[PDB]
Design a protein around this nucleic acid. Structure first.
Ligand code: A1AC6
Length: 1037
DNA sequence: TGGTAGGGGAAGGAT
DNA sequence: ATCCTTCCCCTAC
């Protein structure tokens, strides 16, 4: 009969816009080859491979790429008698769409589903694979969204006193819509129960009656909540139908192994006829939700496919050396490297190279690849850009990669390709996902996102930005840093030349793209982001896509929604806040005596658990808790100049406390199975426990997001206030109970074998949020760890309710208290520890980092300069503006002056002198507008360079003042109409031979030394700079 | 729709 | 000139 849902992906083409560079035409004179052919053409799109040629949209007998498609434009390319009986299947993503009966009356659906989507119904599509390998999609009918409104509040406000009345009023209100979107919608299209529930906020809140309204269309529900009865609090109206499917059917997950089973009236699932399909899948099914169950024994991934891809483009305008722009039809997409792996076997299966102008890849590349067990690359030759892109999208639709990865493909590759397919060549994308049409293929620019239905996009860029700490995230730098495999860099400045020389010098470009994509693939399967995120999704009841791109809040919200709905609440729709921690004012300096480091194990979550903090256990009014005994039944606490009451556990158990306790016991359970488990299983177990730790640390934050979903800043500020009180109490306890060594020996008969020469003292020296650093003069750092363990156990037992726990983690031999939240120390195990200083701050140049590192390394791993710090301590350090520095410090001078050498002596690496700085916002919204990386940004923009994406790190260097520098400064100032305007791209400032500001980098090295070593001189900065000048020849001051 | 503390460097105004 | 403010980077919990 034909398809029931029109396939919008291109399967036929007779005429297209042909654009291609004239540089590829050899029979043209070398003078008539500069421009770029652009114009309409009326020929069937074709692709060349290995001397043979075939139409792009030709599918069947002979193909150049692999194909996993069945339907292709109403053609059933499946061997007749293809009726694989499906029992179990894995699910990775879930689609939420709408289906109307009038539309589907063509398709031969069972009566049940047509009843489920009578006027309109919401259908939940599970996408995945069978164990055999078949692509599968099961359509779940019956899922209904629903939301609550207070009955006593609606009855009186809408002058109605019955649920059918509410149905009438909602239907009517939807009729007189702006655009008459819902014409003819009547009251019988809604279901309205009356049910008893309790708002989640405040303990005083008692149950009441709420209308529950069921809705079949996300559009209808959205419009209702947005402008129905704006004066009436609406509950759980944001809960989408997928979340209802997961929560209301207990046990289901958003990622894992399901099984079809008999249903309520001995109902079986029904397979769809191919002409009814709505996905690029091999078999599809219709079922109600009771036809589903979970399969338990299954634990391993199925044959999901991962496409890693990178692109490379060339300009075409008057300046072919500038950076391309997808909006200009002259700049074109020249090459696309595309490699497909199997995710269950982590094995590369195919390599493909789309190219404008045929080529042959270099032989060194081919030999390396063929020798590394990899497959034989297959090049695809195209005459136009449209044919190349159309073939790429046809590959995407036919092979149907369930996962897609690359590097910075969110801010460059996909937006370029889709801007080409959209603005220039006018191509619909809604079918080029998993759905045959009406799908999702958008790209967004507090985070950039890429959402493709049935296609999981994981940009390894973000993965590395979160997991690895670097100064710049160029793919080669990341490769050398993580795999220790350096590969060739590339720039657009070199691409046109390599293209013009011919097929071999363009095959070089192909080698570069394929090496990039191989590297990305290696990173991917080292970090396994798919398994990590899939485990998070399974934990939070949220589909993998929203797991990646839609933030954290949604996860905690979904689990809390599950628990509250289970326990009789309903979450109300809402759609520097509170005093944080106090850093213990440290008395600075170098400490050589043993230092002990205590800290709490998950302080904030344990506070929540112990004191039963929750939305439902909080109260702002005394009369609410005036009927129970203070202290024994509730906790009174003053937070932010206001009294708060938290009813204790035995009155009303906290929702947050339950979530935390269950998650924790779950984590402990799965971690107790790591030993007696195969490493294959142990990777999955570790990803699982990682996800659990993530959401557990996500609770408190979720509570503190003012104007977020379900915020309650009272809980957050109570948490912080309790933490501060706990630290203060720990300090005062250690001071008062163990001031006398008599007591130490008393509690622990182990300080006998630990009494040191000097006098005995024990005082808290440092503290931050959940940490205590205690000085132990008069004690030997022998087993200070193993005795501090019994100490912290004693403190926890004697001071804090469970599950609050204090542990002893590290004991320092020497430690440098620099300033607040900044310190360096040497652990008793010989390991160094650096926190807060410019050492760890990846915004400084590698030279000053290495220098300051050597300085501190000397300060800790050289006995003479350590004794010299002790001698600086012997005296008040105030007098030393006229006194001489002890001999031990000599070494410093040496290193310092070596610096000067490396600064001015050429043949040094300029990359060893680059600064970095992240571009936070869109630059138009800025208060100073006079920043280094902003200057570099605007200069890069004027120069038609690579405009940096909206949130990367920009590198830069500092120029010295010249006549050209000041002249161009005045000229740019007049065009717009010394301070650190001397900032330049390392690229431009190396090829133009620009010289660095030698004074600035030495003056900073002196500044970082001043900041790091002000501690040893009573923490005075001016004094430290002055007596630092005593390590530098005065001809440099 | 990820929280509060921090320190220190760059730039600019006020004392 | 000296400070004193404010913004901005990136840390530590
Ligand atoms: C690493 O330290 C901390 C990180 C955080 N992070 C966040 O709150 C970020 C966040 C995540 C998710 C959502 Br939704 C909202 C915000 C909070 C407190 C501490 C302090 C420590 C001390 O004791 C703790 O339990 N955490």
């Amino acid at each position: 009969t034909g398809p029931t849902q029109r396939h919008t992906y291109y399967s036929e083409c007779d005429e297209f816009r042909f654009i291609a560079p004239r540089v590829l035409d050899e029979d043209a004179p070398p003078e008539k080859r500069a421009g770029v052919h652009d114009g309409h053409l009326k020929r069937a799109p074709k692709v060349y491979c290995g001397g043979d040629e075939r139409d792009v949209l030709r599918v069947g007998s002979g193909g150049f790429w692999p194909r996993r498609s069945r339907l292709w434009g109403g053609v059933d390319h499946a061997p007749a008698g293809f009726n694989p009986t499906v029992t179990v299947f894995h699910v990775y993503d879930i689609l939420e769409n709408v289906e109307h009966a009038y539309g589907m009356r063509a398709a031969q659906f069972h009566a049940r589903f047509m009843d489920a989507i009578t006027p309109t119904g919401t259908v939940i599509t599970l996408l995945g694979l069978t164990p055999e390998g078949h692509r599968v999609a099961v359509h779940v009918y019956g899922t209904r969204q629903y939301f609550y409104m207070n009955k006593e509040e609606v009855d009186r406000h809408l002058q109605c006193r019955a649920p059918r009345d509410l149905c009438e009023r909602m239907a009517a209100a939807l009729r007189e819509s702006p655009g008459a979107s819902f014409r003819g919608i009547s009251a019988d299209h809604f279901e309205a129960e009356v049910v008893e529930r309790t708002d989640v906020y405040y303990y005083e809140t008692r149950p009441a009656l709420f209308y529950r309204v069921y809705v079949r269309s996300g559009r209808v529900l959205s419009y209702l909540c947005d402008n129905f009865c704006p004066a009436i609090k609406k509950y759980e109206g944001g809960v989408d139908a997928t979340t209802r499917f997961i929560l209301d059917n207990p046990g289901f997950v958003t990622f894992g192994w399901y099984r079809l089973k008999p249903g309520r009236n001995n109902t079986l699932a029904q397979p769809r006829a191919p002409m009814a399909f709505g996905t690029s899948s091999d078999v599809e099914f219709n079922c109600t939700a009771d036809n589903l169950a979970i399969e338990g024994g299954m634990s391993d991934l199925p044959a999901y496919k991962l496409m890693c891809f990178d692109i490379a483009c060339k300009a075409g305008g008057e300046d072919e050396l500038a950076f391309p722009v997808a909006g200009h039809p002259e700049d074109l997409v020249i090459q696309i490297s595309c490699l497909l792996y199997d995710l269950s076997t982590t094995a590369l299966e195919h390599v493909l190279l789309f190219s404008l102008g045929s080529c042959d890849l270099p032989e060194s590349h081919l030999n390396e690849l063929a020798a590394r067990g990899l497959p034989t690359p297959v090049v695809l030759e195209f005459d136009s850009e449209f044919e190349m892109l159309l073939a790429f999208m046809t590959l995407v639709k036919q092979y149907g990669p369930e996962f897609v990865t690359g590097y910075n493909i969110i801010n460059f590759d996909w937006p370029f390709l889709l801007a080409k397919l959209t603005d220039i060549y006018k191509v619909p994308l809604d079918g080029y996902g998993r759905m045959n049409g009406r799908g999702v293929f958008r790209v967004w620019d507090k985070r950039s996102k890429i959402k493709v239905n049935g296609m999981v996009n994981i940009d390894m860029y973000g993965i590395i930005t979160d997991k690895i700490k670097l100064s710049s995230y160029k793919l080669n730098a990341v490769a050398e840093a993580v795999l220790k495999d350096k590969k060739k860099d590339l720039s657009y400045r070199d691409i046109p030349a390599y293209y013009a020389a011919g097929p071999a010098q363009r095959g070089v470009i192909g080698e570069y793209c394929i090496q990039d994509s191989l590297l990305v693939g290696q990173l991917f399967f080292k970090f396994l982001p798919h398994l990590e995120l899939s485990a998070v999704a399974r934990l939070a009841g949220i589909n993998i896509t929203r797991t990646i791109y839609d933030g954290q809040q949604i996860r905690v919200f979904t689990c809390l929604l599950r628990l509250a709905d289970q326990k009789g609440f309903i979450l109300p729709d809402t759609q520097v806040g509170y005093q944080g921690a106090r850093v213990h004012d440290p008395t600075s300096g170098f400490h050589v005596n043993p230092v002990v480091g205590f800290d709490f194990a998950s302080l904030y979550p344990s506070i929540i658990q112990a004191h039963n903090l929750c939305f439902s256990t909080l109260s702002l009014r005394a009369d609410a808790v005036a009927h129970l005994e203070a202290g024994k039944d509730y906790l009174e606490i003053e937070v932010g100049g206001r009294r708060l009451f938290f009813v204790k556990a035995h009155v009303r158990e906290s929702l947050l406390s339950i979530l935390l306790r269950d998650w924790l016991a779950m984590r402990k359970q799965i971690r107790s199975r790591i030993p007696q488990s195969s490493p294959e299983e142990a990777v999955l177990l570790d990803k699982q426990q990682a996800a659990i730790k993530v959401v557990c640390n996500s609770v408190y934050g979720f509570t503190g997001v003012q104007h977020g979903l379900l915020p309650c800043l009272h809980v957050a500020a109570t948490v912080t206030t309790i933490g501060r009180e706990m630290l203060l109490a720990t300090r005062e306890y250690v001071h008062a109970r163990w001031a006398a060594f008599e007591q130490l020996l008393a509690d622990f008969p182990e300080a006998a074998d630990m009494r040191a020469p000097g006098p005995y003292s024990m005082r808290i020296i440092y503290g931050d949020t959940d940490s205590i650093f205690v000085l132990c003069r008069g004690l030997t750092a022998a087993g200070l760890t193993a005795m501090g363990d019994k100490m912290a156990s004693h403190i926890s037992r004697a001071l804090f309710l469970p599950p609050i726990k204090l542990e002893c983690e590290k004991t320092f031999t020497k430690l440098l208290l620099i300033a607040k939240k900044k310190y360096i120390g040497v652990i008793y195990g010989g390991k160094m520890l650096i926190k807060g200083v410019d050492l760890v701050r990846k915004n400084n140049c590698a030279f000053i980092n290495r220098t300051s590192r050597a300085l501190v390394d000397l300060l800790f791993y050289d006995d003479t300069v350590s004794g010299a710090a002790a001698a600086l301590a012997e005296r008040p350090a105030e007098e030393w503006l006229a006194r001489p520095l002890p001999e031990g410090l000599q070494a410093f001078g040496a290193v310092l002056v070596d610096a000067h050498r490396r600064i001015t002596d050429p043949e040094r690496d300029i990359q060893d002198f680059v600064l970095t700085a992240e571009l936070s916002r869109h630059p138009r919204a800025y208060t100073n507008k006079r920043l280094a990386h902003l200057t570099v940004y605007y200069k890069l923009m004027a120069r038609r360079a690579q405009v940096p994406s909206i949130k990367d790190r920009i590198p830069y260097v500092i120029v010295a003042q010249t006549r050209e520098v000041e002249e161009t400064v005045a000229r740019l100032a007049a065009l717009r109409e010394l301070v650190s305007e001397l900032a330049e791209d390392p690229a431009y400032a190396i090829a133009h031979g620009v010289a660095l500001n030698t004074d600035y980098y030495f003056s900073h090295l002196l500044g970082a030394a001043c900041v790091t070593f002000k501690a040893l001189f009573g923490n005075n900065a001016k004094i430290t700079e002055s007596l630092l000048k005593r390590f530098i020849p005065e001809v440099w001051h």
